[PDB]
Amino acid sequence: PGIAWIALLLLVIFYVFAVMGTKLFAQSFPEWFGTLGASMYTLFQVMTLESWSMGIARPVIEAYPWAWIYFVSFILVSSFTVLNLFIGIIIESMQSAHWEAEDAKRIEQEQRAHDERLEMLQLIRDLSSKVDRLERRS
Amino acid sequence: PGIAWIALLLLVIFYVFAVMGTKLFAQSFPEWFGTLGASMYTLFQVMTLESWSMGIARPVIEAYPWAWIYFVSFILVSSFTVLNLFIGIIIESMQSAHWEAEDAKRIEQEQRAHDERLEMLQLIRDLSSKVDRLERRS
Amino acid sequence: PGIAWIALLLLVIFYVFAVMGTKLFAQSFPEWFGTLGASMYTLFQVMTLESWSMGIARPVIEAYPWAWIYFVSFILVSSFTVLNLFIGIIIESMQSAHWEAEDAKRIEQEQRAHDERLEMLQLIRDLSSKVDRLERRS
Amino acid sequence: PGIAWIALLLLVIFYVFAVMGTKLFAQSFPEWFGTLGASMYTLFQVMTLESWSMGIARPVIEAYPWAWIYFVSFILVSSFTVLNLFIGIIIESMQSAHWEAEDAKRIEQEQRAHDERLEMLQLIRDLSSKVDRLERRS
Ligand SMILES: [Ca+2]
Ligand SMILES: [Ca+2]
Ligand SMILES: [Ca+2]
Ligand SMILES: [Ca+2]
Ligand SMILES: [Ca+2]
Ligand SMILES: [Ca+2]
Ligand code: NI
């Protein structure tokens, strides 16, 4: 398992949407989705939202009016699984640094004093033992 | 109950703004604001800031002066309510992967000792009597 | 003050920069910098990186070769004090629903660490204080 | 050392890619790559993804079509090290507000007891010793 297990998926979301888009607009926007690699590129351009809509979608949408769904969806997914990936890093680097350290040091400072209390506790039975013997010898 | 509230609110924000956008720039910028389902797009584009001003606002404003406020305001709120939403995952993904798991494991370990330092404590008051029995009894 | 202090700072930064566009690209790029409320607008557009130099400072810089310094810096500063501000929100949001009231409940956990402890010791001394009345006899 | 370590890195790439990019495109795309000083510009114009494929890579690519690779890669890395760099600031600011400051408050309410109980303890022996000293007394 893991976090970069998304870098797997994203590039498959990609693979998917590329092939999907290529099958459609290969026909009539072979400028962009002429080929797979072409769609690949385009879709990374779209990933980046560098004229994503006016450049690509809207033209494509004029020809294929529903395409809006394709482009709008790809985006929400593309971006979403990046946000989902990017944060998995905020986390796996956030708590890589002072959060492994602390958990260990308090796992340590805590068993430090189940140590202290418990035995120090003991001398008190050892005392309720020495003294125990003496209300007897009273 | 939860953060889909911002989502909802931010989805409200769309509905709400796409609504006005439709009615106003409808007749002037009809590809952009003719039908709701096309101010929706256009706003989702505006949302993404993909040729947001030069493509849509400037022209909507080169005609309608106040529209600026419309677009600007939409953006600030749009982005802002996500920023708020985005972070609400950084946090809830942080207060889920890390901030929550010890929140339990430390009151889990604190009670382990108020039951032990207070357990200690009985013995110490109980040595108190067995001996307060001896300033007098022995 | 805090987050809202950068807020101010930035909006300072903005006015201070739309200040210049208007004093500066006014005669000539009046679509963008002709007057203030239009630099303001432009500046916000430029902030958000919608056609910022292709649309804007490439043709402004077809005007002035130095102007590049103008739009570039504005961004690196503009973007910069937001990153600074944004972060101040992950921070003052990330330690506000997860990390804030812990320091108060662990103020309080470490609080009885004295209450029990100190009162226990109190007993200890009193034990001794009487035991010592028994070096006195025995 | 610190993290400007990455500022170096990115800035090495920002330099490296413009030098690499003048070599190729200087010839035939002068307005963007016929120099370094405007390559740089362009490359930060590219850094930002303002008309990146559409404005630039595409027509450039049109000429040296494998130019995609240079744009795409640039971008993946340019961005990616700002991600590693931005994160740094998230962490070196989340590890600065409470991470560094609070860790110290705990060094203190940790070492407060190994001192408090040392002597709670201490008094426990003395007590034991007097009774232990009362074995060879009576
Ligand atoms: Ca073309
Ligand atoms: Ca149409
Ligand atoms: Ca005009
Ligand atoms: Ca011109
Ligand atoms: Ca403790
Ligand atoms: Ca454009
Ligand atoms: Ni913590």
Exposed, middle or buried by CB within 10 Å (0-12, 13-18, 19+), for D100?
A: exposed
Residue A131: its chain D contacts at CB < 8 A? 131
Rg (CA), chain A: 32
* Sequence-distant contacts of C75-83: CB under 8 A, at least 24 apart: C75/C46, C75/C47, C75/C49, C75/D48, C77/C13, C77/C17, C78/C10, C78/C13, C78/C14, C78/C17, C78/C46, C78/C47, C79/C47, C81/C6, C81/C9, C81/C10, C81/C13, C82/C10, C83/D86, C83/D89
Torsion of CA C10, C11, C13, C18, to 10 degrees: 150
Residue C40 token pair: 């303001």
Task: List CB contacts of C75: < 8 A, sequence separation 6 or more.
Answer: C46, C47, C49, C52, D48
In angstroms, the CA C73 to CA C75 distance is 5
In angstroms, the CA C13 to CA C81 distance is 9
Nearest-CA residue of chain C relative to B95? C98
Task: Answer yes or no: are the C-beta atoms of D86 and D75 closer than 8 Å.
Answer: no
Q: Which has the closest alpha carbon to B2: A92, C88, C97?
A: C97
Q: Which ligand is nearest to the CA of C31?
A: 3
Residue C125 token pair: 């001394």
Using alpha carbons, list the distances in angstroms from residue B58 to B39, B51, B80, C63.
16, 10, 22, 21
- Domains along the sequence of chain B with CATH: 1-138 (1.10.287.70)
Residue A94: its chain B contacts at CB < 8 A? 94, 98
Neighbours of chain B (3+ CB pairs under 8 A): A, C
Task: Answer yes or no: are the C-beta atoms of C7 and C85 closer than 8 Å.
Answer: yes
Residue B10 token pair: 């931010």
Measure CA of the first residue to CA of the last residue in chain C; give whole Å. 70
Rg (CA), chain D: 32
Nearest-CA residue of chain D relative to A89? D87
Residue D61 token pair: 């690519």
In angstroms, the CA B71 to CA D28 distance is 39
Task: Answer yes or no: are the C-beta atoms of C40 and C18 closer than 8 Å.
Answer: yes
- Cα of C31 vs centre of ligand 3, distance in Å, is 6
Give this entry's resolution in angstroms: 3.5
Q: Please report, as a single letter, which amino acid is at residue D70.
A: Y
Phi-psi region of D4 (alpha: psi -120 to 50; beta: other; left: phi over 0): alpha
Residue where the block lists tokens 């040296």? D64
Task: Answer yes or no: are the C-beta atoms of B71 and C50 closer than 8 Å.
Answer: no
* Sequence-distant contacts of D35-40: CB under 8 A, at least 24 apart: D40/D14, D40/D15
Check CB contact under 8 Å for B131 and C133.
no
Rg (CA), chain B: 32
In angstroms, the CA C98 to CA A94 distance is 14
Count other C-beta atoms under 10 Å from residue C78's C-beta.
Answer: 21
Q: Which has the closest alpha carbon to A46: A64, A27, A33, A28?
A: A33
Q: What angle do CA A76, A82, A86 make, to 5 degrees?
A: 145
Length of chain A (residues): 138
Residue D11 token pair: 């800035």
Residue B113: its chain A contacts at CB < 8 A? 113-114, 117
Q: Which has the closest alpha carbon to B68: C14, C33, C42, C46?
A: C42
Neighbours of chain A (3+ CB pairs under 8 A): B, D
State the helix-helix crossing angle for A99-125 and D99-111, rounded to 10 degrees. Answer: 10
Task: Answer yes or no: are the C-beta atoms of A45 and A56 closer than 8 Å.
Answer: yes
Task: Answer yes or no: are the C-beta atoms of C27 and C16 closer than 8 Å.
Answer: no
In angstroms, the CA C18 to CA C41 distance is 9
Residue C3 token pair: 């987050």
Q: Which has the closest alpha carbon to C94: D83, B78, D93?
A: D93
Using alpha carbons, list the distances in angstroms from residue D130 to B79, B133, B135, B138.
74, 17, 15, 16
Q: Please report, as a single letter, which amino acid is at residue D120.
A: M
- Residue D104 forms contact with C (CB below 8 Å): no
Q: Please report, as a single letter, which amino acid is at residue C5.
A: W
For this PDB entry, the determination method is: X-ray
State the helix-helix crossing angle for A36-48 and A5-25, rounded to 10 degrees. Answer: 120
Give A53's DSSP letter: I
In angstroms, the CA A119 to CA A115 distance is 6
Q: Which has the closest alpha carbon to B79: B43, B108, B51?
A: B43
Burial code of B52-89, b = ≥16 C-beta within 10 A, e = fewer? bbebbbbbbbeeeeebbebbbebbeebeebbeebbbbe
Check CB contact under 8 Å for D91 and A94.
yes
In angstroms, the CA D8 to CA A37 distance is 33
Q: Which ligand is nearest to the CA of B41?
A: 2
Residue B52 token pair: 């947001």
Task: Answer yes or no: are the C-beta atoms of A10 and A81 closer than 8 Å.
Answer: yes
Q: What angle do CA A8, D53, A46 make, to 5 degrees?
A: 45
- Residue D35 forms contact with A (CB below 8 Å): no
Backbone angles phi, psi at A126, to 5 degrees: -50, -30
Task: Answer yes or no: are the C-beta atoms of A56 and A42 closer than 8 Å.
Answer: yes
Q: What kind and span of H or E run contains C40?
A: helix C36-48
Using alpha carbons, list the distances in angstroms from residue B110 to A110, B69, C31.
9, 55, 66
Q: Which has the closest alpha carbon to B82: B7, B138, B1?
A: B7
In angstroms, the CA D133 to CA D3 distance is 63
Q: Which has the closest alpha carbon to B124: D113, A113, C136, A120?
A: A120
* Sequence-distant contacts of D31-36: CB under 8 A, at least 24 apart: D32/D56, D32/D60, D33/D60
Burial code of D73-87, b = ≥16 C-beta within 10 A, e = fewer? ebbeebeebbeebbb
In angstroms, the CA D18 to CA D24 distance is 10
In angstroms, the CA B35 to CA B23 distance is 9
Check CB contact under 8 Å for B132 and C134.
no
Q: Please report, as a single letter, which amino acid is at residue B116.
A: E
Strands (E), chain B: none
Task: Answer yes or no: are the C-beta atoms of D116 and A115 closer than 8 Å.
Answer: no
Length of chain D (residues): 138
Torsion of CA C39, C44, C45, C50, to 10 degrees: 150
Give D1's DSSP letter: -
In angstroms, the CA D26 to CA D129 distance is 91
Task: List CB contacts of C72: < 8 A, sequence separation 6 or more.
Answer: C57, D41, D44
Residue D130: its chain A contacts at CB < 8 A? none
- Cα of A51 vs centre of ligand 6, distance in Å, is 6
Q: Which has the closest alpha carbon to A65: B35, B27, B52, B28?
A: B35
Residue where the block lists tokens 């400037």? B58
In angstroms, the CA C105 to CA C34 distance is 58
